[PDB]
Amino acid sequence: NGYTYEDYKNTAEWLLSHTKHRPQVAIICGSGLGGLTDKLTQAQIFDYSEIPNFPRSTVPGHAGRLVFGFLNGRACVMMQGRFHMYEGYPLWKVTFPVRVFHLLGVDTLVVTNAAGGLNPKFEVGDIMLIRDHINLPGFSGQNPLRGPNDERFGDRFPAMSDAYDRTMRQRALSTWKQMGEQRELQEGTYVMVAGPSFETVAECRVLQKLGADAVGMSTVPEVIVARHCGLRVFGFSLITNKVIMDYESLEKANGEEVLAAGKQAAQKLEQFVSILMASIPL
Amino acid sequence: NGYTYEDYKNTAEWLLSHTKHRPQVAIICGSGLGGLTDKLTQAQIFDYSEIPNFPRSTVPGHAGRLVFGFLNGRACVMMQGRFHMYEGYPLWKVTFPVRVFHLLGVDTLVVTNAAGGLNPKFEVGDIMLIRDHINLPGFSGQNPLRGPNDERFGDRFPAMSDAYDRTMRQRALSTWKQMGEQRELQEGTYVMVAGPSFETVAECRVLQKLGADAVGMSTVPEVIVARHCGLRVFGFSLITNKVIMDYESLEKANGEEVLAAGKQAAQKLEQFVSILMASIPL
Amino acid sequence: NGYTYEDYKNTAEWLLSHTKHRPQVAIICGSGLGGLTDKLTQAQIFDYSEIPNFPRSTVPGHAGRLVFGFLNGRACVMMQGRFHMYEGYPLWKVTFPVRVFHLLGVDTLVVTNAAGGLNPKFEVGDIMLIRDHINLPGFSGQNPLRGPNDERFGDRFPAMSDAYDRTMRQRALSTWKQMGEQRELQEGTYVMVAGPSFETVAECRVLQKLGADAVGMSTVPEVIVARHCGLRVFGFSLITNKVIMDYESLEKANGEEVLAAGKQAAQKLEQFVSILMASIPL
Numbered sequence: 010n011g012y013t014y015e016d017y018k019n020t021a022e023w024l025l026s027h028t029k030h031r032p033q034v035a036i037i038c039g040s041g042l043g044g045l046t047d048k049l050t051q052a053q054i055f056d057y058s059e060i061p062n063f064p065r066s067t068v069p070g071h072a073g074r075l076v077f078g079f080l081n082g083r084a085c086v087m088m089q090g091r092f093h094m095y096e097g098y099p100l101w102k103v104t105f106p107v108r109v110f111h112l113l114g115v116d117t118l119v120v121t122n123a124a125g126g127l128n129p130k131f132e133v134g135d136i137m138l139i140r141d142h143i144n145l146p147g148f149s150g151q152n153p154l155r156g157p158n159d160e161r162f163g164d165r166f167p168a169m170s171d172a173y174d175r176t177m178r179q180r181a182l183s184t185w186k187q188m189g190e191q192r193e194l195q196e197g198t199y200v201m202v203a204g205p206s207f208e209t210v211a212e213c214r215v216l217q218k219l220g221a222d223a224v225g226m227s228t229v230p231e232v233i234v235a236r237h238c239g240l241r242v243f244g245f246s247l248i249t250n251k252v253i254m255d256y257e258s259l260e261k262a263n264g265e266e267v268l269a270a271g272k273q274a275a276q277k278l279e280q281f282v283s284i285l286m287a288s289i290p291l
Numbered sequence: 292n293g294y295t296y297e298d299y300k301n302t303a304e305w306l307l308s309h310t311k312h313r314p315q316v317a318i319i320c321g322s323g324l325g326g327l328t329d330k331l332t333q334a335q336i337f338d339y340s341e342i343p344n345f346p347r348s349t350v351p352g353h354a355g356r357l358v359f360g361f362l363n364g365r366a367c368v369m370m371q372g373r374f375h376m377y378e379g380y381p382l383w384k385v386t387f388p389v390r391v392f393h394l395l396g397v398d399t400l401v402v403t404n405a406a407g408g409l410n411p412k413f414e415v416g417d418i419m420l421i422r423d424h425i426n427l428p429g430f431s432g433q434n435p436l437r438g439p440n441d442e443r444f445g446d447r448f449p450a451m452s453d454a455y456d457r458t459m460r461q462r463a464l465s466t467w468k469q470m471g472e473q474r475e476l477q478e479g480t481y482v483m484v485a486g487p488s489f490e491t492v493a494e495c496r497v498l499q500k501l502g503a504d505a506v507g508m509s510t511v512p513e514v515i516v517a518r519h520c521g522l523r524v525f526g527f528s529l530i531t532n533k534v535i536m537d538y539e540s541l542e543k544a545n546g547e548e549v550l551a552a553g554k555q556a557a558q559k560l561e562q563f564v565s566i567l568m569a570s571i572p573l
Numbered sequence: 574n575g576y577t578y579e580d581y582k583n584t585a586e587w588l589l590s591h592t593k594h595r596p597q598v599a600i601i602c603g604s605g606l607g608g609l610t611d612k613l614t615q616a617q618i619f620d621y622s623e624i625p626n627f628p629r630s631t632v633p634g635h636a637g638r639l640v641f642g643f644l645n646g647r648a649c650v651m652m653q654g655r656f657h658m659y660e661g662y663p664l665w666k667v668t669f670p671v672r673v674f675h676l677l678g679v680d681t682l683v684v685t686n687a688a689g690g691l692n693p694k695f696e697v698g699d700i701m702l703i704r705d706h707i708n709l710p711g712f713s714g715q716n717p718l719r720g721p722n723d724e725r726f727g728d729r730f731p732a733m734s735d736a737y738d739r740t741m742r743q744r745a746l747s748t749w750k751q752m753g754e755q756r757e758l759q760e761g762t763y764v765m766v767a768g769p770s771f772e773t774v775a776e777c778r779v780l781q782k783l784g785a786d787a788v789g790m791s792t793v794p795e796v797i798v799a800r801h802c803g804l805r806v807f808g809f810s811l812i813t814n815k816v817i818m819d820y821e822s823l824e825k826a827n828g829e830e831v832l833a834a835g836k837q838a839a840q841k842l843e844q845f846v847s848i849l850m851a852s853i854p855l
């Protein structure tokens with residue numbers, strides 16, 4: 010890890026002295042979900058590039074910013090553009106923001122992402138509440154906590170079986186119903202794979218056989234660092250496509266559609282997140 | 292990645308100005324399949340060591356060369372000796388040649404390798420057409436495309452579900468029959484594991500349970516980079532041994548036998564490849 | 574790999590000239606099993622920090638030492654405190670001691686560790702004889718033999734299907750009975766995961782579906798290097814906890830209990846190891 014405790018501290022204090030905002034809830038916007046930033050009020054934008062120690066967003070579109078504001082009665086800080094292992098960043102950079110949030114005073118992390126559906130019951134547009142995850146990269150060594158542990162953040166061996174807050178998941182399922190929606194709110198296991206190339210049929214079958222319901226290339230690292238910090242964690246995936254699971258089909262998964270699904274059924278997640286803020290204690 | 296676009300370009304131009312040959316089909320010879328180089332005509336050999344930017348073959352036997360020539364009516368470039376992740380090379384070096392081939396004007400990549408048979412229906416000497424692959428290293432981060440993407444080669448998120456050209460696989464199965472052979476042409480999923488040590492019984496069972504038919508320590512990376520490039524891809528594995536899948540057996544897998552199987556039933560693959568060249572469009 | 578053959582040699586010769594002891598059996602003590610060092614006679618302690626080239630134990634408790642002595646009629650060398658991939662050490666440092674032992678004249682390696690039980694038949698306190706292992710990190714590239722092979726230690730492609738000496742496992746099962754004990758001696762497959770965070774329910778299910786019986790974050794690397802060396806290998810796991818495999822449960826795995834289980838049923842393993850020394854040929 011190239012960061013010392015001092016680095017996270019200096020970044021936090023810099024942000025704290027450059028904004029009057031004092032966030033409680035940190036929100037990481039997934040692909041095609043950045044619009045969520047338009048709902049904040051008293052918004053204050055910071056480009057990643059101007060924040061000390063922040064990983065500088067190479068060329069996804071040069072759009073990387075931290076937005077502080079209020080979302081439905083709660084002090085928030087949103088990440089529009091998140092870092093991925095596939096871009097070359099080691100996991101300790103990918104999750105650097107998370108530790109910064111903790112030092113800013115955040116106690117809750119909401120993570121969102123787009124994902125391929127592995128469970129056949131899913132349909133494009135569906136929203137999957139994350140009940141659990143399978144950290145394939147972590148099994149091999151790619152775990153954001155690798156390296157000496159700093160007691161100031163947490164313990165050497167944090168547990169992850171209760172990573173996704175049960176209370177929030179319940180309140181989430183409730184909220185979704187209180188709103189009265191067509192499709193039900195899906196729930197399941199998210200499996201992380203490094204990417205960036207999409208899965209083959211054989212691989213799709215492997216992930217299904219392991220019990221995963223949705224597949225993506227992010228999130229798990231941020232969740233592990235958040236939990237290591239003591240943060241309350243809740244999140245979901247926007248199923249942007251159904252992964253090909255048999256050779257009959259003659260269609261390919263593309264980053265184009267993922268942003269397209271995250272175009273129509275996108276605002277659906279946005280509203281759900283804003284409303285869900287009232288369900289977050291303080 | 293330690294290579295800049297310029298590096299691949301300079302290597303291509305160097306080769307292009309040192310040979311009159313202009314290859315269309317690149318062929319990577321697997322273990323004990325190097326003999327395939329003896330079939331080229333108007334052959335011109337280049338030691339890896341003399342080609343700018345090429346990874347220098349440590350000590351597999353110091354035998355690493357790029358051979359340009361004609362194979363059954365087609366301009367080829369063959370790799371005699373391929374790079375493996377287990378030797379210490381990062382994946383961006385392992386696949387460096389592939390991007391060079393694309394800049395040389397190659398539009399087809401034929402990959403061959405020796406592999407352990409996981410499917411019980413296989414026998415030593417069998418030839419397995421590769422229909423799909425399981426990229427275990429890729430799930431964890433070891434994917435040759437990790438790092439910033441260069442649009443000149445391809446897209447950020449290339450698909451792999453159609454990696455192995457369906458047309459060539461069909462024409463391959465046809466060719467094999469047109470020849471009238473004893474054993475049928477096997478077909479299945481290739482699973483890549485890093486190695487270099489051989490699998491345990493428990494591991495063999497894992498790979499079988501995942502749906503893999505053959506196991507090796509190469510190929511998948513080259514295939515992913517080729518596809519990212521737009522190359523047509525086809526290949527197969529020479530089953531050199533049947534992996535031990537139960538504790539009853541008292542025999543061990545050894546690099547000795549692998550080269551031995553690749554001694555008798557070796558030329559069988561060689562001919563098949565030469566003849567298959569006529570089935571490759573232009 | 575940052576070590577040259579010379580480095581292992583110089584470390585061996587340094588130890589050989591600083592102790593009259595000439596070990597035959599090397600023993601690696603797992604978590605909460607360090608007490609085994611109290612049974613040696615004519616004991617001579619070396620701090621890891623004073624041994625040339627040894628990885629310096631960061632801050633697990635600053636307790637890292639190599640103890641030479643005699644254990645029940647056999648010249649031993651014990652590692653009190655072992656290195657883990659999760660602490661940041663690359664595998665070639667984690668396994669550095671193993672190659673040193675081989676140069677000291679050791680011909681047998683006994684590895685012990687604490688592990689989470691995946692097989693439901695297990696209970697806290699149980700002892701599991703290791704019959705086989707699943708090297709998840711190894712599938713992805715994290716194998717201690719990655720990099721050029723040195724013929725002086727072993728072959729390029731060593732087999733692992735017979736890693737755990739069948740004779741010792743038999744003599745172990747015998748010994749356990751000759752002693753007449755309540756609980757039977759368990760036996761099964763050990764799966765290595767990098768850690769340091771504990772498994773989620775979904776992950777627990779994956780590991781079970783793969784056929785693993787116990788889960789830990791060490792051992793496999795040392796075993797592979799030992800075998801590559803020609804060392805006889807035998808070992809076992811102390812089940813310190815039963816991994817949560819369903820959402821009903823409301824308890825979390827913690828490094829606290831692991832050391833606690835390794836407190837009561839700890840000496841049970843210690844005696845078993847001492848007595849088992851008589852079963853090790855010479």
Ligand SMILES: O=c1[nH]cnc2c(C[N@@H+]3C[C@H](CO)[C@@H](O)C3)c[nH]c12
Nearest residue numbers: 040123124125224225226262264267
């Ligand atoms: O089928 C899939 N496989 C793996 N990841 C995704 C995702 C998630 N994100 C979306 C984004 C690509 O469009 C990249 O960062 C991956 C959506 N569908 C799939």
Ligand SMILES: O=c1[nH]cnc2c(C[N@@H+]3C[C@H](CO)[C@@H](O)C3)c[nH]c12
Nearest residue numbers: 322405406407506507508544546549
């Ligand atoms: O049983 C097996 N397991 C893993 N790889 C192979 C291979 C393939 N290559 C062959 C070569 C060793 O002889 C090394 O680079 C692995 C053949 N049989 C097996």
Ligand SMILES: O=c1[nH]cnc2c(C[N@@H+]3C[C@H](CO)[C@@H](O)C3)c[nH]c12
Nearest residue numbers: 604687688689788789790826828831
């Ligand atoms: O449930 C488990 N999952 C993964 N490893 C362990 C272990 C083994 N060691 C023990 C030690 C933590 O207490 C760390 O190095 C892991 C015991 N129980 C479990």
